[PDB]
Structure 1
Amino acid sequence: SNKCDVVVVGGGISGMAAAKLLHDSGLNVVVLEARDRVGGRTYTLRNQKVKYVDLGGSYVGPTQNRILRLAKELGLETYKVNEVERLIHHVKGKSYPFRGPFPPVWNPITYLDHNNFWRTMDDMGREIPSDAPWKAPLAEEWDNMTMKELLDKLCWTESAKQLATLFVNLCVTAETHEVSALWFLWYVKQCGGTTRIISTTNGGQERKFVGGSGQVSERIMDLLGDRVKLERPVIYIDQTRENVLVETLNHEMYEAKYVISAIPPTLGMKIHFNPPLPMMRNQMITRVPLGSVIKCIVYYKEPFWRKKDYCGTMIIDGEEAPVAYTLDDTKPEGNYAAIMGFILAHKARKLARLTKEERLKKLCELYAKVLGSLEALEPVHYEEKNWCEEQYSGGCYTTYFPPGILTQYGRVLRQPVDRIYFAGTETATHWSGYMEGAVEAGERAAREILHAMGKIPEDEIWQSEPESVDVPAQPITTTFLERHLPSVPGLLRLI
């Protein structure tokens, strides 16, 4: 058996960040990676037609200081996602160009209803602790409802309900009826709220890495050399003896003092445990699916939308559109012109039966309609990735909680099992579900082990992160009117 201090299961950003921290402290680490590559839910493809493209996780923004610091140390640089020109909201077959992060509403009733919906999401989130959403005062009430039920209660207009629905689908790649209200409200709150999570400028979609996000995992693998073992899916963890034994599918045996599980919670099911896991974890890892998404990038000779004062951001309502949201994927030099679109949730399941060429045609015809340009019909290249088909991801972007699961099982996610500690973006308390959360969780799980070894004190397990000098955060502001305008039922009670 191959002996070390710590076995990290998974070479995504979380496992790699944990292995780097432990290695830098002088421990002997092995990373066991199921795939022939590192990066997990990040994947940068290179070819002459795209140069590079992020087919998985890509965007970083202000307040994501851990991923910005790790990336910067590895020698990576960011560029700004194009948002110079106007965004488009496509509603009932027509494009309404706009500026600022929220699509505007002109009907006064619809205005009140939209304003109330976003405000209520943040008002609710203020009562949900980031590190313990199950301790929200109304935790059971909110956990025993879907986001569909909450939206049915909150939204007096079909206008607000359809945009709120698009918001849920885009944020967590799942249907409003699939997900706990408590979990979704926590999810928004722990990215800093609605403005911060939906914003390009001054939010989660502000920036991409020059050369792709896959370089974070690749360059940590560079540092660690042959400590990273590719095509070693873990099948068996034995904790009955003095050292932990980890076995891979290719029959190799690893022996360590501790283990970091840096895999999506439900992919814990692929591992046979001795002794069996405690009951709550045993059932938890069956209750925590990942969402459904195809990430699709259509390439054009030029960023032609910019000539019409469109930035390439499209918010597209309605069942018929295959893609509900797009960003300009053009490289900083203005070349490799491209539109990134997501095929989300039930549409990812529905449209996966088509050919690649059939999806390209549907996307080009949608983009031609929304951008009002025949140039959208003349793509020069297409890349896509269906994350639903990934045995060692389970989906993307992240794990969602169905109704009732977070209050019953949420406590178990980070709870150590003997000498196994739990990393993965799912265990983060800030930008859980993102590359930032992957870094937070890996580093925390690594410091839990340093503390178990007596190397650091308890108060050093969770560590704050200084603000990026390169990507500083501006405050989220609200207007007097946004804060005090009544809801629709509010305006009724006042009549």
Structure 2
Amino acid sequence: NKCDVVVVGGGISGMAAAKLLHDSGLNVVVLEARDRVGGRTYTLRNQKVKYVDLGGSYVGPTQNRILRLAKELGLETYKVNEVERLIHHVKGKSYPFRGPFPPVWNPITYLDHNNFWRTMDDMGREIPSDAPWKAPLAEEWDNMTMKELLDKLCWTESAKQLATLFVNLCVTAETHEVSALWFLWYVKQCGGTTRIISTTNGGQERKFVGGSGQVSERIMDLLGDRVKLERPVIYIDQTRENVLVETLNHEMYEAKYVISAIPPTLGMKIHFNPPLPMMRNQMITRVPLGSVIKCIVYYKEPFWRKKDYCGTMIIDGEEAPVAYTLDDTKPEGNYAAIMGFILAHKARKLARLTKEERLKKLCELYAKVLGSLEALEPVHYEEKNWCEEQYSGGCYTTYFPPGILTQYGRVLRQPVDRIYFAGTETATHWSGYMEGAVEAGERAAREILHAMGKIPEDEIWQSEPESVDVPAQPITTTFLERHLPSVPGLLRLIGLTTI
């Protein structure tokens, strides 16, 4: 079975790579482990839900590559409901609000909160998107956990608790599990704190009509029989003139080049000849994925809207199974639903329960948070625990524990002879997202076009025109946000005055 390029993995990244190469007139094969394409995207269809995303779902302004690819495939977006009030639930009580950040009134707490978000972005600006290990304090920042950074930075428990939730929710891991440098990089390369946490004008603004799984499905339709399902790759041999790729089901593929479009650690499932170089050999043992269960509770009507709640709940407490929800009602206003994430250690703990037991705990939580008995009357439930997936390893993405990004980060997308590396983890803008998957797949594909002498080197990395359908409002700060003192800043001001 001979071709120009074998693509290992049929997620968005591998499918985007294969489509680009196909369009450029090369012969490509996609080898996919599962009986389906889409990977960490999966759209379930049945009569009770019509369609529902159980994996990656949201897209927003500045994610121009996924929007362009989706639009070319004939897909459309709609806006996630944020008409009514958001809810912050903390210490057993709900506080409705507007705007992206839960507000605080206590003046000291206000300064601490303001300084926390500001400092995340300040540190971010020191970190190159394409080379985080080149930050001036890369080593110092990489040698501490996010827990350690929050302990230093947050002078109030209020700010520390919200910051903790921010980390758990954005990277499906505990603050003590992840590198501070890596987390700060991750946020900055999404455009900063406001962009990453926002619905309106941020990452959660929109979803695809009919589900995100259609992106991979529609590319498979374009590629025809070039996509091979239930072909897990077990062996890559680069000792001869052409690369040999072998699958579990006893097939051999021969190619000039290979794109690895799988999560970095899942490279461990492949035996390499010759052995990988030392730094990659070790890197792929050091980069786990996070832990999450995505849960959707269906209701007769979006009853929360009648109480002037949009369906967004930011829920702080150890007893709460879910820390974040969004309205998942269809744009037509039917199949009323609340989507919630069970995160990090809670995914581990609550996976021990039955599906029926998890549904009951979510409804009881939502009833309390929304002050609504109607939340106790679900009509349907769907969920997906991504921790159990052999060919994902977790969700949403790969996290770096302390010390790893500075020692091993440079080899993430370094070619190994005729193997090139795609997958969202290798992106420099919205790495961890569907957007980053498209950036990495197309970049890897063009690395091979360059190696073949079909394009000049300056065309490997390509800028993306802004979407005309999803324009990006700039991120702005106020004078007060920029110049109000931190808590230690204020204490320094007090000590000075009184002298």
TM-score computed with the length of structure 1 as normaliser: 1.00
- CA distances 1:16-60 after superposition (whole Å, capped 9, x unpaired): 000000000000000000000000000000000000000000000
Q: Kindly indicate whether residue 327 of structure 2 is the aligned counterpart of residue 328 of structure 1.
A: yes
User: Partners of 1:86 and 1:477 in 2: how far apart?
Assistant: 22
- Gaps in structure 1 of 5+ consecutive residues: none
Which deviations, in whole Å up to 9, do the C-alpha atoms of 1:105-135 show, x marking residues without a partner?
Answer: 0100100000000000000000000000000
Shift of 1:378: 0.2
Deviations 1:293-319, CA, capped at 9 Å, x for gaps? 000000000000000000000000111
CA distance in 2, matches of 1:459, 1:139: 28
SS at match of 1:291: coil
SS at match of 1:183: helix
Secondary structure of residue in 2 paired with 1:494: helix
Q: Secondary structure at the match of 1:110?
A: helix
Match of 2:34 in 1: 35
Output the CA distance in 2 between the equivalents of 1:304 and 1:452: 57
Instruction: Please list, as runs of the form range in 1=range in 2, the aligned pairs for 1:89-238 lying within 5 A after superposition.
Output: 89-238=88-237
Q: Deviations over 1:164-185 (max 9, x none)?
A: 0000000000000000000000
Report the secondary structure of 1:76's partner residue: coil
- The structural deviation recorded for 1:152 is 0.3
Post-superposition CA distance 1:224-280 (Å, at most 9, x none) = 011000000000000000000000000100000000000000000000000000000
Tell me the SS of whatever aligns to 2:51: strand
CA deviation string 1:185-238 (max 9, x = no partner): 000000000000000000000000000000000000000011000000000000
Pairwise mapping of residues 27-426 of structure 1 onto structure 2 (< 5 A)?
Answer: 27-426=26-425
Q: Distance in 2 between matches of 1:312 and 1:491?
A: 37
What CA deviation, in whole Å up to 9, does each residue of 1:394-449 have, x standing for no partner? Answer: 00000000000000000000000000000000000000000000000000000000
C-alpha contact 1:113 1:155 (8 A) present in aligned 2: yes
Partner Cα distance (1:317, 1:176) in 2: 15
Distance 2:107 2:152 in 1: 20
1:134-156 deviations in whole A, cap 9, x for unaligned?
00000000000000000000000
Mapping of residues 18-29 of structure 1, within 5 Å: 18-29=17-28
Q: For 1:432 and 1:315, how far apart are their aligned partners in 2?
A: 24
Q: Give a deviation string over 1:362-394, Cα, whole Å, max 9, x none.
A: 000000000110110000000000000000000
Instruction: State the Cα distance separating 1:91 from its structure 2 match.
Output: 1.1
Q: What displacement does 1:78 show?
A: 0.1
Partners of 1:139 and 1:414 in 2: CA distance = 19
Structure 2 unpaired stretches of 5+: 495-499
The percent identity for this pair of structures is 100
**Residue 465 of structure 1: how far off its partner (Å):** 0.1
- Contact kept? 1:65, 1:468, Cα under 8 Å: yes
**What secondary structure does 2:35 align onto?**
coil
Cα distance in 2, alignment partners of residues 372 and 448 from structure 1: 55
Q: Residues 243 and 257 of structure 1 are in contact (CA less than 8 Å); yes or no, is this contact kept in structure 2?
A: yes
Distance 1:139 1:81 in 2: 37
Do the aligned residues in 2 keep the contact of 1:162 with 1:318 (CA within 8 Å)?
no
> How far apart, in 1, do the equivalents of 2:91 and 2:106 lie?
15
Q: 1:483 & 1:383 partners in 2: Cα distance?
A: 43
Contact 1:67 1:436 (C-alpha < 8 Å) held by counterparts: yes
SS in 2 for 1:441: helix
Answer yes or no: is the 8 Å Cα contact 1:312–1:328 preserved in 2. yes
CA RMSD of aligned residues (A): 0.3
2-structure distance, mates of 1:159, 1:51: 41
Cα offset for 1:452? 0.2
TM-score norm. by structure 2 comes to 0.99
Q: Distance in 2 between matches of 1:318 and 1:178?
A: 19
How much does 1:282 deviate?
0.1
SS at 1:208's partner residue? strand
SS class of match (1:3)? coil
Q: Is the 8 A contact 1:425 1:434 kept in 2?
A: yes
Instruction: Say how many residue pairs are matched.
Output: 494
SS in 1 for 2:467: coil
| 3-state SS, counterpart of residue 47 of structure 1 | coil
Give CA deviations for 1:326-351 in whole Å, capped at 9, x if unaligned: 00000001100000000000000000
Q: Distance in 2 between matches of 1:5 and 1:375?
A: 58
